[model samples]
Target: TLRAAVFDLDGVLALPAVFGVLGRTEEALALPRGLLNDAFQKGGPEGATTRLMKGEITLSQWIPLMEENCRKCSETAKVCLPKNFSIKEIFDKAISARKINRPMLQAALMLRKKGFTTAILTNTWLDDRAERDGLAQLMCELKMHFDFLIESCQVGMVKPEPQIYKFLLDTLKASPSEVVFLDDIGANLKPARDLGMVTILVQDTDTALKELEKVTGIQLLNTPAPLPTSCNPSDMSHGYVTVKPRVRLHFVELGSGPAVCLCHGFPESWYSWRYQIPALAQAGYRVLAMDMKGYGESSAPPEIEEYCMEVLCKEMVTFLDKLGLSQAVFIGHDWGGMLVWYMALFYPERVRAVASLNTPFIPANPNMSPLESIKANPVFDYQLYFQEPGVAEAELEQNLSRTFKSLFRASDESVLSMHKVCEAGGLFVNSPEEPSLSRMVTEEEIQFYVQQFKKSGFRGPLNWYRNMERNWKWACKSLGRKILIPALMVTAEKDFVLVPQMSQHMEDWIPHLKRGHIEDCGHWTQMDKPTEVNQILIKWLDSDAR
Candidate 1:
């Protein structure tokens, strides 16, 4: 039986506060970014840092060695060491930066309450003096949630070493298969795995805790729990709530700081942002991934005008109002992207920043509506097909599986074209039975979309197209006023409908604009290239764009 869950310190339970402080310190001191970890690990495997972990050295003794290494690192990087840069000062900053991983804390405590052995098997220098200041309080608070705390310092052993793992097994009286161990370091996990324990590499605590749920079958979270330091979409509760508008909305929320709202496009819900929630949350922003009105669990309004950009813009700012947030960094794709762009112009006060994927900042033409523009381009004739109310719905609803499979196309697969739409008697018809998983459309993931559209149907989503003239009229309200907030437009090369060329002139409308291009990426920018998108988005966010 799965009876115990063991977690490592630093990266796992302590939020890697070392790197957090290092990053901030580098930023503040005008040194290179992303290399502080190298300085921290300068002496290799047998360095004093390792000795500290093994209880062979005191924190007092390790400080000078670290300071010497850090100075050397800065000197080599051409940004010679700053005057009065003390190792003890850095330690103070890092220790003060430490944060308890809330999701893991909740899971561990829940496991203990259910009579499972919850423990910390750590490689740390948390001796009496080292644990003084802020770290001791956080560690003390964390210890109360678990059944045992195994400090490698006390045992003169560290992770990836077979002896410490064996000691853990002996202490818990647990069979190797019964104890699931989680650690951030790859080397540390191998020992647990070699010992026959179920091992989870905690790259992101949110995802690790989800795996923990499957291993133990315990309900660890009841609400959208406050996040840990880095990325895995947390398994928190999803619920329907009434917002400032007369609409019931559903969202996945985590992390804490300034709010970052994620809005998905046509035929998709909050799940489309599955990969983004953790990345932003881990980087210190609260994420609100919403199931937009008329999609997923959100209330679907029946009228055509209700889905216009004007109404949606109001709904979003009001949504923030309901959350008691005055502003948010709005990130969107496709229709949601269009909504956020409009949100900036209509209600600048409520938007701190805007990031659009695939869909660029396409202002409604003062001369003609989007329907007229797309009617000329048959590939986007799907928009025209969707304009006739139940016609496309009748076609799209007939087989939900084929509908999503048709839409979530592979990069190498044929892009959506008017010829194909006509050949199939309508879009989303006669699709392949099997879509490639690497194409980013997994079978089960597609199934979720099928089930969602089955409930709300395509009527509400398509109604967005019927209001082309209405949205264009809404855009005319402030024809010349530029979007003042920081904006990021991420375009995919192969997305036939919304190609990279669409956003070329965006700088004219958005004064503060950053453009990111994804090579060979299709319409689904986030899904087609999640890792790249995460890197681009996280880097932009970290670049102080917000």
Candidate 2:
């Protein structure tokens, strides 16, 4: 298996500082085109750039060294070098205009989620105090995408040298054979290739990602959707689409042909379909996974009743219409499953087929509130806690990332039974410090979720639980109706709260329902058992019924 992926920083991840400075200085000095770059190469690797990158020389010393090289290059080229040139001004201007390579950033993050150890290996110079602080801030913004950042300035070793590559191999505890190195420069990649590592020349982003996709059957290409003006920064390059007809909703689309719409449950976004998105797309279907109202980059109405089943169902119908799809196969999980079931019940003409992960269809009972019904069985008492306003919201919003770690954990029946009932206290035990996460959820993934929640508070998502009674009232018309479409219910064997028994009565309600269970899986059915879920979905969708 390819365990790790290492990248070059300047040319691969961001624009080189030298070019930025050269362009700015040329404009300021009214010099000939490309004069500064020619002078730059004349200085060479043995000049001040290498010494400064290795921390052996200060920026002041480097400035004088470059000035002399510029004068010599100007003499050779029959061009006059500017008199009294201040290198400090040009250097400062260059660093300020530093732009990140968007394609590379997206590719690196996608590679990490696809189970690769992604890293950045840079030959960076950070000699000046202000320049050093600015670079530090830039790295902090991109910290989640990289597993490790190996910098020449920090390690006292530059690239094209085998010593730094050896250092990376030792740190990863990986053989060079298992490593894939990408760099814009041939010299930097030469040593990595000599060590038996797969080296890719990143001449352009599209070409590089295509080469990467062949090595690992994961889809790294941008999706086919209009570029989004407003989207979560984490999903900026993944072909994230924003729809605004009745309400503005954020979604991701993949592949082509018949449409399959996916809805995620509470405290989750479209990202929940990370594995299924690529699989279904490659299986010859157009997949649309959306971040429902009050979640992700989607619109979150302040009114509590706005999230009721009636309004949500209308929005879903409008959502499909906005995408120009008259009918689509709907798949949902958790709260999403509940909405899709409503779609099939209220707007049957809009739905061709439906499948739900972990969530099963249950007829609305006018006799009792959803909170009371959930409390009737202590195994599902968490719903009661979620029903209250500002309780679970405050707790979850207080420590967003920790709450996600605790909720999206990989657990069996034992852990589920332990926390089945939250009678009085908070839904999750609010620890003073965040707990260590299991291997199932990576740190980068958690960070991505955290960033989204941080922008859109928990109050919007909390509104979904708060409207259970209201949802029951809105769903009164279709209380006893059966979902008249081809249906599939995927239940997880190890899921604690949404027990396998919950899906038994699905067939009783829906005449054409098909039920399948995955062994050794938990509440996160799609993520916990992606391959099994994809196979089940593909077989059903390709069947005569669909």
Candidate 3:
């Protein structure tokens, strides 16, 4: 619920110093004083001035220098450099000249009338009496009233520090989530938002006031929604379409008529869509792919809980909500493909279309432990090692590009041999001591895997393995549901991870399923043969097919 509104003074509620006495000193007034011209020729403020602003030099030191400069230029320089310069009155005159505060003041009053507590928090020096009296006079003349005022001089701190925000919360008796702060500076707004305050940066007073009207539900002004530029997919960067906060879950766009969201598997970023993004975008549909939490560039929470499949599913739902998209054509590949299946089963309403690559949904078999089940099949010997902490990630990070190569390693003879070996008892064989990651690799491939793995380490990705059982349990709670949306599943032939039977029962599992198989492709289908992959996406998105 909306509770309070906070405004930042100086450059926000009031204008900044228009012309400081230093700028209007005798040297500046001598009709282009030759020495003043020489000062400009000196180029940039003195090193001392910059140091003072950076806090490397004390104000006493800098002020004395200013007095020295003024004295050298004029006899009455001390009067001009007086410590009691009326900064507030100067600011008041500036605000009146700019007409900066009235519209926002009215907006704040309206919010107050609607029962919102209003306040202004200024980041000005409190040690100066002239500044305070001038501010009082400015407020009194303009009737710039606020329920509370927090001046940095009294608080001895400024914005962008978490403590100042905490102080504001404490004084207002409000939680971070309960207040909204507006400032013209991005730096200040950043900390405010990080602490959970709804923030708006005041760019133009008119536009800022108009945004305030949005929250207050008052149309103080009418402005047309800006026109979007060219829509040629070839020209635009295919990414997430920003939507209003309220209509977050209403659209699923992909190519032209519909939208589909593509998710890449482990060790992948949206860059995985290098071929597919352009293909989909050129086809006139917006495509959004994610760097899921704990993967790629997304947030990687330290807790293993963040990587649970259930948590991932919630992120998908919330992402859709934040985008104002209701249902989307959900497509996934590898680990991404598995998520697609789960999403269709758990939240079908958010699934208008679904597709997966190289992965198949294996519904809950209550008697089988996650590892035991995957381990029963020799091909998944990797799962056993994955269950162990840091060992795999630590090892993989040692050679990132090599690890990625290990994932893509496949040859006619080796593939057949592994299939036979895996079919019998899985990678564990008779015991758990034997290594499986090296069985299907080369030195060059190993080097490649090392580079990729080192990019984000394996802790976040490993968190996924840690959540297998948690996923199984969570899926159990929402059973008896089938995907009701139009769906597609693609398999990579010659891919040892999911053999011929991996997707055999998908039709039964997903009644709306349409399936395809890509031959001559390995588990990393998107990266291996992008042109073919792009064609597959275009085929499905085209009207001629569905």
Candidate 4:
């Protein structure tokens, strides 16, 4: 039986910075790319990085030696060092940056939760004890997940040495056959394998999880969705439909009556409507909950223009045509709420009625661009962060588990400073420390959400925000335009981002508006208060307001 799991820190549980610093140093000095790595060999057998890992030298002593090594290697290459090139900055850059391997860390936590003793065996230098973004902070952050952390610098040994593997097993009180070890290096795996421990060489994060799954019988990452709560997995079946050339969409179908199509927003899939699907279907309505373009199993067009509100609204109507339905009541939350509101304005003939949760219509200001208008409000500054294509994608995709966990929240705590997360830093600038599973979503629900996002990524979703100017140009047509159809705006009391007050006074746009509110609910209204939301949905859908 597998009793314990051991992990390597750098490149396995955390990012290794030694080589990046070396390459950047080479580039900043106009030298060859491989020059600094070659120079590292002169310091020790396992190289200077390993030497540093083994505590042979301090940071102050190491800088001079690296400079001298570079000086010697420069002579051999016949390349003179630039007059003012500083090798210290390379170390400075490495020391300054600290990024966690969130997926691997999350996987380890899963294993630990499954009753396996989790430990970390890393080859790292002693001075990380003093640096702020160092081993000490890393230990504090990772302290709860693992049973033990064995650092080579602390234990007077490093990995691939064979003896440390024995030390690791001894520390865990487990035999070789009873333990599994994971590392990014082949050399590190050999000794662990030789001792009869199951060893996985991690080349890719997802690939490593699969190998680990084979050994442990525990599903770690990228699991297939179990789907909507209280519904049969087979009954709430999801499949792909080609709405257009290169525009296939993944959707879940249920029931048979008046069509009620669902549209989800950024970083979310049709799974966001898990609670609503069963209720809507049971209430005698055909439910067509779809994964928007670039989400879930849906088509992700590469061009930014393809994600414009104009294009998305058109494809939604086209999607309806493909289903042989003329129109359907549209319901949306978050970004989808914004999309459905525009759909009522842009294609009222194809929209039976519209219902929005947590999102209120923002009438376009004709004078300012969407970027400028959003940036004007400090609370809305995060939209500006999403306008740049690759910038937000990189930050969001870095740690998807954290991305979904933080995003599908039930608390309004993050609302006040959310825009600052992008304005000051990246999306994870103020990630919750050891966030307990949200009251609105189960642990499995969050796991499934992350897995779907792992497939599609943030590029397609962020692209939606990138089309702000184009959306603004198209939205100009709807200036002062009223819904002229049955409309329901359900506000969540605790949703500080889209406050309850934002939903007020929209009667001017939707004169036949039906207003509802869910007390103590956050952004995810349907998921948070599923019963209350469903009650209001059934009541309003049956009302004679239209």
Q: Pick by lDDT: which candidate is best?
A: 4
Candidate-wise lDDT, in order = 0.78, 0.76, 0.62, 0.79
TM-scores, one per candidate: 0.65, 0.58, 0.48, 0.57
Could you give candidate 1's per-residue lDDT for residues 345-383 as a string of tens digits? 888888888889988776667887666687676567667
Off by over 4 Å in 1: 1-120, 123-234, 237-239, 244-246, 415-424, 433-438
**Span of ten consecutive residues with least summed lDDT in model 3:** 224-233
How well does candidate 1 match the true structure, expressed as C-alpha RMSD?
11.6
User: Could you give the C-alpha RMSD of every candidate to the true structure, in order shown?
Assistant: 11.6, 15.8, 22.2, 23.2
Whole-model lDDT, model 2 = 0.76
Q: Which candidate model has the greater lDDT, 1 or 2?
A: 1
Model 4 TM: 0.57
Give the higher-lDDT candidate: 1 or 3: 1
By lDDT, rank the candidates, best first: 4, 1, 2, 3
- Of the two candidates 2 and 3, the one with more favorable TM-score, higher being better, is 2
Q: Summarize candidate 4's per-residue lDDT along 1-546 as a digit string, tens digits.
A: 898999887668776546656776678677877888787767565566566667787656666777888889889998888888666766666755646787788888778868999998988765622443445546656654688989887787888888889899889999999999998888889999999999898777889999998889998877643223343334567867787878898899976678888888667888878788877776668888989998888988778998988999898988888877888999988889989999999999999999998889878879987777777767677777787778888877787777777777766545225667664777667676445566566788888878888786888888888888898999998986888888889899987678989777788778888888899987777787778888898788777322
